[PDB]
C-alpha cells in the first residue's frame, strides 16, 4: 500500500512571536545625532501596525522594531506595577493591549501608543528636542492625526513633526518617478497611482485585506479543519508564521486547486507543523476528509506525536488567494486586487484630464510594497492578471521593492531632512496656531 512505501514525514516545529533578548538604550545613537550638521537630524518612525520601526535619518536601517503593544499589570506577589511596551512584552502574563484597532491601519488605543513612544525614545537613548518624521495611514482620520500630534507636541515637546505614507516613501526610495504603487501590508492593501512623484490619492483604493486578515482567516480554517478538537492551543500568532513560511500565491488557482487533495503527490503538497506534545473495502484510504486532515498516511489517536500536528493542504494556496478573490473565498465583498488595479488603469487614469500618457506611463512601473506582497509568484500572478486587461503589447512591468519591509522606513529617512521635507515640517508654534488637524500637503503625504 502506498503509505507503507512513502518515507517518514518531515515536520516543522510551530513558531510564534516570542521574546529573545533585552536591548539597552543605544547611547551611541544620541552621540551621533549631536555630531551631525544642524537641521540634518530627525527621528524617523515607521509606525507600522505590525512593527513600529524607529531610528535616525542619518542611518541606513532602524535601530528598533517592536510590536505596537503594551502590557501593564500589578504583580500581586510583589506589590509593584510592571509595564512593558514592545517585545519585552513577551509577544509572561500577556495583559496585552494593542495601539491599533484590529484589522485597521488606524491608531485608537492612545495609551498603548504613548507607552510605545516612551519605549522608542528610551531605547533611542534620549534623556533630557529632535524633529520627528512619522508615517501615517493612507487617508488617516483627522481625529487620529490630532491625537498623535497632541502627544508628540504636548507630552514630548518635539520641535517639528511631519506625516508621510509608508507606501510612498518606499516608492521614492526605489527611484519611483511615475507608476502604480501596490501596497499589501499587515493592516490593509492599497493601490495608489503616482504621477510625477505626486500621489493621486483621490484615485487610490483600499481593499481591507492584509497580513492580519490572513492570519485570522488561517486560524478560522484550522479551527474548522480540526473542529473535533485540536489538543494544542491555536493562536493567530502561530498562523501568522504559517502564512509566512508555507503559503504562496497560485499561478492558476482553479487548475491547481481541483487536484490539490489528489492522493498521488499529496505527500509533498501537504506541510506539517507539530505542536509541542507532552510525551507519555471502503475505508480511510479512499476517503477525501482523511487526505484533507491527515494526508497520505494512516492516522491513530494513540500517538501523541501524530495528534498535536496540523496539515495545511489547501490553505497553502487558499489563504493568499483572498486578495484576488475576496468575495468568493472570504465574503469580503470587495473587488479583487487585479480588478482594482485594472479599474484604475483602464477607467480612471485615462479619464482624469490632467494626466498625460495614461495608462502607458503607469504600466511601465507597477510597484509592489509591504510585507504581505512577499508571497512567491505574487508578482507573476499580478502581471498575468493585468496583462489580460491591458491592450495588447502594452509595456506592463511589475517590480518588487528591495527589502519590501524596511525600505519604507529607508525612504522616510532619506527624505526626512530634504528641503521638500523641511518645507513640509510643522513646528510646535504652527501646531499651537493651527491645531493637530492641520498638515502641510506634500508629495508623500495625505491631503
Amino acid at each position: 500500500e502506498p503509505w507503507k512505501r512513502l518515507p517518514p514525514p518531515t515536520v516543522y516545529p510551530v513558531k510564534e512571536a516570542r521574546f529573545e533578548k533585552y536591548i539597552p538604550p543605544q547611547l551611541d545613537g544620541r552621540e551621533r545625532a549631536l555630531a551631525q550638521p544642524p537641521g540634518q537630524v530627525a527621528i524617523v518612525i515607521d509606525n507600522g501596525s505590525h512593527s513600529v520601526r524607529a531610528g535616525w535619518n542619518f542611518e541606513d536601517k532602524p535601530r528598533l522594531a517592536i510590536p505596537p503593544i503594551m502590557s501593564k499589570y500589578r504583580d500581586r506577589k510583589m506589590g509593584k506595577t510592571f509595564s512593558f511596551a514592545g517585545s519585552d512584552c513577551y509577544a509572561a502574563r500577556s495583559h496585552i493591549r494593542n495601539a491599533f484597532e484590529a484589522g485597521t491601519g488606524i491608531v485608537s488605543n492612545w495609551d498603548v501608543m504613548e507607552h510605545v513612544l516612551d519605549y522608542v525614545f528610551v531605547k533611542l537613548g534620549m534623556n533630557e528636542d529632535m524633529p520627528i518624521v512619522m508615517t501615517e495611514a493612507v487617508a488617516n482620520l483627522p481625529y487620529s492625526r490630532k491625537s498623535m500630534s497632541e502627544i508628540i507636541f504636548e507630552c514630548y515637546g518635539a520641535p517639528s513633526l511631519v506625516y508621510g505614507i509608508d507606501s510612498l516613501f518606499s516608492f521614492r526610495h526605489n527611484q519611483g518617478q511615475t507608476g502604480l504603487v501596490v501596497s499589501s501590508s499587515y493592516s490593509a492593501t492599497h493601490v495608489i497611482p503616482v504621477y510625477n512623484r505626486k500621489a493621486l490619492l483621490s484615485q487610490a483604493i483600499r481593499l481591507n485585506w492584509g497580513g492580519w486578515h490572513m492570519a485570522e482567516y488561517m486560524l478560522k480554517l484550522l479551527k474548522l479543519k480540526y473542529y473535533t478538537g485540536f489538543p494544542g492551543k491555536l493562536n493567530s500568532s502561530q498562523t501568522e508564521h504559517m502564512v509566512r513560511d508555507f503559503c504562496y500565491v497560485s499561478l492558476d488557482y482553479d487548475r491547481e486547486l481541483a487536484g490539490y487533495l489528489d492522493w498521488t503527490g499529496l505527500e509533498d503538497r501537504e506541510r506539517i507543523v507539530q505542536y509541542p506534545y507532552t510525551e507519555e473495502q471502503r475505508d480511510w484510504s479512499k476517503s477525501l476528509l482523511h487526505a484533507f486532515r491527515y494526508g497520505p498516511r494512516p492516522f491513530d489517536p494513540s500517538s501523541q506525536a501524530e495528534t498535536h500536528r496540523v496539515h495545511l493542504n489547501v490553505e497553502r494556496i487558499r489563504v493568499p488567494e483572498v486578495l484576488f478573490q475576496p468575495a468568493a473565498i472570504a465574503g469580503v465583498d470587495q473587488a479583487g486586487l487585479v480588478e482594482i488595479a485594472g479599474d484604475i488603469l483602464c477607467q480612471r487614469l485615462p479619464s482624469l484630464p490632467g494626466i498625460q500618457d495614461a495608462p502607458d506611463a503607469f504600466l511601465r512601473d507597477v510597484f509592489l510594497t509591504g510585507g504581505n506582497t512577499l508571497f512567491q509568484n505574487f508578482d507573476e500572478r499580478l502581471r498575468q492578471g493585468l496583462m489580460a486587461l491591458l491592450p495588447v503589447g502594452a509595456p506592463l512591468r511589475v517590480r518588487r521593492a528591495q527589502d519590501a519591509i524596511l525600505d519604507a522606513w529607508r525612504g522616510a529617512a532619506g527624505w526626512a531632512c530634504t528641503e521638500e521635507a523641511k518645507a513640509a515640517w510643522i513646528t510646535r508654534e504652527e501646531y499651537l496656531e493651527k491645531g493637530g488637524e492641520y498638515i502641510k500637503e506634500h508629495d508623500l503625504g495625505n491631503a
Binding site: 488605543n109 507630552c155 474548522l224 482553479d254 487533495l261 489547501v314 487558499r318 469580503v332
Partner: protein, 109 residues
C-alpha cells in the same frame, strides 16, 4: 530557585515603569475618553471612502475543504464538493454549521 530569581531579574531589567521618563511633560494629562473607536470617529463627522465593491461573477468553493463546489445544500446553506462532504455537513454538531458560514462571514444568527 535561581531560575525563578533570574526570571525576576529579567522581568525587572525589562520593566519600563521603574524608569522616570525625563522627556515627558508632567503637567500634560490626556482626556481619558480619547480612545474612541473608528466607528465613533467616523460617526462624529456628521478619506475612508477608498473601499471598492465588485460586480464580477463569483466562483463557488467548498465550505469544508475549499475545493470547488458544484453543489449548495438547501438545508445548511453550506457549499460542498462531493457527497462525502455532504455526509459530513449534515452530521455536524448543533452549532458547527454556523461556524462554517462565519468563515465566509455569512451569518443567520
Amino acid at each position: 530557585q535561581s531560575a525563578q530569581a533570574a526570571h525576576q531579574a529579567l522581568v525587572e531589567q525589562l520593566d519600563l515603569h521603574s524608569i522616570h521618563k525625563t522627556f515627558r511633560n508632567p503637567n500634560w494629562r490626556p482626556n481619558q475618553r480619547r480612545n474612541k473607536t473608528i466607528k465613533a470617529i467616523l460617526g462624529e463627522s456628521q478619506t475612508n471612502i477608498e473601499s471598492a465593491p465588485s460586480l464580477a461573477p463569483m466562483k463557488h468553493y467548498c465550505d469544508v475543504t475549499g475545493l470547488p463546489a458544484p453543489y449548495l445544500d438547501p438545508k445548511t446553506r453550506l457549499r460542498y464538493h462531493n457527497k462525502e462532504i455532504f455526509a459530513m455537513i449534515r452530521n455536524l454538531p448543533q452549532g458547527m454549521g454556523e461556524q462554517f458560514l462565519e468563515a465566509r462571514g455569512a451569518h443567520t444568527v
